[PDB]
Subunit: 130 residues, 2 copies
């Protein structure tokens, strides 16, 4: 089987700055699974960040962790089978390895248990400088 999720983007930014990440999904996964993002902060277990409903075309639900509400946003481009993670007003505390995830057992954007994730993209380092 070919890799389901492929991540793009990352790097070092300054506090207050913004950065958007992206991830492609196979046609099949893009339409069947809830897709979302996780982040693995230094020395900590990866936490849920954001989720978007399955097959996010013209309309969809989005859901967020309290710690990123209003600052982070998830969206999609069905044409490119791609989902995005917009991160505004980054703080040093957002420094983490960012992971995209799919869960075929969910349809509506919600909290994702990492134990239930069917596929992961490769983690990407996002560093926010003080």
């Amino acid at each position: 089987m070919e890799v389901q999720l492929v991540e793009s983007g990352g790097g070092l930014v300054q506090a207050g700055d913004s950065l958007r990440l992206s991830c492609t999904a196979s046609g099949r996964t893009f339409s069947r699974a809830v897709m979302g993002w996780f982040r693995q902060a230094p020395g900590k277990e990866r936490e849920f960040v954001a989720a978007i409903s399955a097959a996010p075309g013209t309309a969809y639900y989005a859901f967020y962790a309290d710690s990123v509400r209003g600052r982070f946003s998830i969206s999609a481009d069905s044409a490119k089978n791609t989902v995005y993670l917009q991160m505004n007003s980054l703080k040093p505390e957002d420094t983490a390895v960012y992971y995209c995830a799919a869960d075929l057992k969910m349809q509506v954007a919600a909290y994702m248990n990492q134990r239930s994730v069917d596929y992961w993209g490769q983690g990407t380092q996002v560093t926010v400088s003080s």
Copy 2:
């Protein structure tokens, strides 16, 4: 919650040579899960490699994927809460990012699907040149 798995090792190696992987887990996760190894060849989904489970006393049970039979040795050490994977007679075909896994539901080492994995260690590159 602090990071459950922390893996070590990886790197460039010549065909025919050996390379060891190791991974630590928290005391609670180690004693509660079957530890495993997955690998993700370029452009592919992460495939099961080997699993190891604790049995009464000093005993363990080990299970290997057909692709890596005989050539790899899996082991674990309770005193250190670590699981090892010694890979021998490495081939270009073995080139992948290697992941250590913890499955809390499984009791005896057996084929492990990635969806059953509770925790992951940071991926580590292993490239085998001919």
